[PDB]
Amino acid sequence: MQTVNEMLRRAATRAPDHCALAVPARGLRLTHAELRARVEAVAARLHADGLRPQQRVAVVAPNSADVVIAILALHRLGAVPALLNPRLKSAELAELIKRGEMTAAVIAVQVADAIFQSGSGARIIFLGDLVRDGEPYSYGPPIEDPQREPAQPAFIFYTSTGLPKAAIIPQRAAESRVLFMSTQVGLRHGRHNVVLGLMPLYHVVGFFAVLVAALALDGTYVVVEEFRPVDALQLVQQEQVTSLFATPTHLDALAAAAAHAGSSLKLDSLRHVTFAGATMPDAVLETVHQHLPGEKVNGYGTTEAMNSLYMRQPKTGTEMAPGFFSEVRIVRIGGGVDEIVANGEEGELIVAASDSAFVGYLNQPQATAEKLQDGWYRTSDVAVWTPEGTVRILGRVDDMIISGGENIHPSEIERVLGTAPGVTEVVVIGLADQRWGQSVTACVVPRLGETLSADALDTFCRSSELADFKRPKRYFILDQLPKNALNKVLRRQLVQQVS
């Protein structure tokens, strides 16, 4: 094995005086040497306050040099961090820590009350009581490196039917979760590496593939506390960013800035632009190609298994192929891992549960047994093999629509309607109905000020590429879609509100 801790420590010894963390806004830099000292010291101080290996500690913070120190220090201690989205509802967070049977929670958010008053046995730690603006608050004797087993829990990330599940990431999962950035994305070891921390740390990509990779390759992690497209493009040039991994939205922002930015603005050093673009619309992709530099690679992955597919220089966003570490198959929906589909027939994408795999969801054994089957991980996504020997992601099995014996993916239809003039957003659901089973229904929201009509949206679709049966049978023009705390559509529920 090489654990996270080990990866980062060996790095320290290879490049003590090279820059590890940079918060350019706060005019802060730490070398690898300096960043080890602060992990060490915080680690000791949390241990001095009585808090042992294998104990789960929650982390609720937005991206900052301070939380990076906090998380590493916990792992260095031996505590198993459970990283949580700070945009979750107070209620929700308080719940997951209660369920999580967690010894403490480091927070930088208040929402503190929602916890202190959750009835949870969870010692509430203010983040700024540990470290703040780099140098931390230290006492206790330098503690020892605890033994770590390959399958022992190491970190806990959250996914999402009901409340988000808690995926346990074993110690042995770190390496391939990092190195796929190198085998797939083309990063190599070296002090030239300057990685821009745009992806949140509470996400496996933001943590393993961005933070950890950047450090473990003896490079520099550039901290970003708040995303602004121009400021970011400025960081690239100013910081010598060599690679960045960004969400489809981030990219759209960046590509348009770069376009309305002539070359002002030398993005020369940017060599890799990486993204999980299964859901990236065709339009955005190509503004990314036209307007941003460096090699673009498209990746598909999951919290459970990390990276499963990719495309260098992608033409579309849906169509990818497995790289190093991965093994994949497409099996009949609801059926044995061994039931590979014909070719051209759609099915569930499933991927080998090797070393990068999680070990189960904390305290959800049915959930786990729904997902880890005979040493395979079940994506719950629907794919098909292209005659070109690649995998086309069609959409989530859960969102699939079954309309008189036929397979309809709301996402396809959402991508066409999304371009109809006048449409600010759309979700396509299957109304519990007839023709039969389910009738394809479009819920669309107009651009500020503007009118839509079902007639006009139908003619638009009629003029479009969609096969007969895919066309919506019905439209509801709404002035907003109900979403959860995480800007994401309450599908099951929208249905109640329209049927």
Ligand X SMILES: O=C(O)c1ccc(Cl)c(Cl)c1
Q: Could you list the residues that contact its own copies (CB under 8 A)?
A: 1-2, 6, 10, 13-14, 150, 176, 179, 182-186, 188-190, 216-218, 312, 321-328, 352, 354-355
User: Which C-beta is closer to ligand X: that of 342 or that of 486?
Assistant: 486
Cβ at position 372, least distance to its own copies in Å: 18
- Cα gap 490→473, rounded to integer Å: 21
By CB under 6 A, tell whether 368 contacts ligand X. Answer: no
Stretch that binds ligand X, among 100-108, 296-304, 377-385, 455-463 (CB under 6 A): 296-304
Cβ at position 330, least distance to ligand X in Å: 18
Binder of residue 287, out of ligand X, its own copies, none (CB less than 5 to 8 A by kind): none
Q: Which amino acid is at 354?
A: S
Cβ at position 313, least distance to its own copies in Å: 12
Stretch that binds ligand X, among 132-140, 293-301, 365-373, 455-463 (CB under 6 A): 293-301
Binder of residue 301, out of ligand X, its own copies, none (CB less than 5 to 8 A by kind): ligand X
461-to-121, 318, 319, 402 alpha-carbon distances in Å: 55, 21, 23, 20
310 and 292 in contact (C-beta within 8 Å)?
A: no
Stretch that binds ligand X, among 132-140, 295-303, 317-325, 437-445 (CB under 6 A): 295-303
Cβ at position 77, least distance to ligand X in Å: 26
Interactions with ligand X, residue window 197-216 (CB under 6 A):
204-205, 209
Binder of residue 323, out of ligand X, its own copies, none (CB less than 5 to 8 A by kind): its own copies
417 and 428 in contact (C-beta within 8 Å)?
A: yes
By CB under 6 A, tell whether 301 contacts ligand X. Answer: yes
Binder of residue 307, out of its own copies, ligand X, none (CB less than 5 to 8 A by kind): ligand X
Binding-site size for ligand X (CB under 6 A) equals 10
Stretch that binds ligand X, among 16-24, 144-152, 298-306, 397-405 (CB under 6 A): 298-306
Q: How far apart are the first and last CA of the chain?
A: 53
Cβ at position 10, least distance to its own copies in Å: 5
- 3 state SS of 19: strand
Q: Which amino acid is at 431?
A: L
User: Which C-beta is closer to its own copies: that of 192 or that of 474?
Assistant: 192
- Cα gap 226→220, rounded to integer Å: 18
User: Which C-beta is closer to ligand X: that of 209 or that of 211?
Assistant: 209
User: Which C-beta is closer to ligand X: that of 299 or that of 360?
Assistant: 299
Which residues, 6+ apart, have CB-to-CB distance to 405 below 8 Å?
Answer: none
By CB under 6 A, tell whether 307 contacts ligand X. Answer: yes
User: Which C-beta is closer to its own copies: that of 40 or that of 218?
Assistant: 218
User: Which C-beta is closer to ligand X: that of 276 or that of 330?
Assistant: 276
422 and 455 in contact (C-beta within 8 Å)?
A: no
Interactions with ligand X, residue window 258-277 (CB under 6 A):
276
Residue 239 token pair: 């910081």
Which contacts of 378-383 are long-range, i.e. CB under 8 A and separated by 24 or more positions?
A: 378/348, 378/350, 379/302, 379/308, 379/348, 379/349, 379/350, 379/351, 380/348, 381/348, 381/349, 382/333, 382/346, 382/347, 382/348, 382/349, 382/407, 382/409, 383/330, 383/346, 383/347, 383/348, 383/349
Distance of CA 220 to the CA centre of its chain: 21
Binder of residue 205, out of ligand X, its own copies, none (CB less than 5 to 8 A by kind): ligand X
Residue 56 token pair: 């789960």
Instruction: Look at the block and give the residue holding tokens 């994949």.
Output: 328
- Cα gap 380→129, rounded to integer Å: 42
Binder of residue 266, out of ligand X, its own copies, none (CB less than 5 to 8 A by kind): none
Q: Which amino acid is at 452?
A: L
Binder of residue 182, out of its own copies, ligand X, none (CB less than 5 to 8 A by kind): its own copies
Footprint on this chain of ligand X (rule: CB under 6 A)? 204-205, 209, 276, 299-302, 306-307
